[PDB]
Amino acid sequence: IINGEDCSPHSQPWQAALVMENELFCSGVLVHPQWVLSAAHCFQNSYTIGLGLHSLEADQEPGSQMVEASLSVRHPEYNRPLLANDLMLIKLDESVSESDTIRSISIASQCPTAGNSCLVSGWGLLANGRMPTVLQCVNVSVVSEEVCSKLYDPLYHPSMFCAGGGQDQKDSCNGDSGGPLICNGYLQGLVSFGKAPCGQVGVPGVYTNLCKFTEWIEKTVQA
C-alpha cells in the first residue's frame, strides 16, 4: 500500500495473509468460513494463511490462526484473455470459528460506481521501498470504464476495474495482490495489477471486478 497509514488493529478482519516459508507474497479475503478468495495469479499448490493478524507474527496477535490449504479453484477463464478473470477460491483444510478479529464478508452485487471512495488494505511495499510491519489501509476512488480502457487497452477486460490515480498518489504495491477493495462495507474487488512503478501520478491500479463472478463464487462454495 502506497501512501496509506496503519489500519486500526482488527478493523479489516476478513483479511487473509498468504506466506511462503514465513514470508508474505499475497493477501486474500475470507468470504466463507472454509474459503479464502485471492488472485488467480497468486496460485500455489499449498498455502499457509494467517487469519486475524495485524503485525505478521501470530504469537504477538491474540485470536490469530495459521491454517493450511491444499486446494484452490482458479476461474476456468483465467488468463483468457491475458490478465483477465484473475480470481481463485482456496478451500481451507478445516472451516474456522468467526471471532471479532476473524469474520467473513459478503461480495458486492452491483458494479462499482465511478467516484466511489473505497478502502484497500495489505502488507505490500510502502512509498519508500520497504515492507510495512503492520497491515496498511488507503482510500482510492473508482474511475470510469472509459479512463480504464484508455489507460490499459488492449488488455482491459470488463472483469477488471480501476481505482486511485488521485493527485495524492494512493495505490496498491507489490505484495498487496489478492487483498480487498471494500466499497460501502461490501467486497467490490481484489488487488490485481497496474503500471510499474506503483504510485505513478494519475495512474489507477486494476482490481478483479467481483460483481461479474458472484454466481461462479456462490455455485463453487455450495458444491
Binding site: 511462503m20 508474505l24 507474497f25 499475497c26 488472485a39 495469479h41 497468486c42 491475458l82 490478465l83 505490500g124 511495499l125 496498491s172 504495491c173 507489490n174 505484495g175 498487496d176 495482490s177 488487488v191 490485481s192 495489477f193 497496474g194 503500471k195 510499474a196 512503478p197 506503483c198 491500479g205
Partner: peptide, 24 residues
Amino acid sequence: FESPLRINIIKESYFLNIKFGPSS
C-alpha cells in the same frame, strides 16, 4: 524482472519485462 501483477515474486508462467538500471 517486472510484472504488472502486484506480487513480490516471479513465477515461470508470468510475461515479464527484463531491464537494466534502477526500478524508476
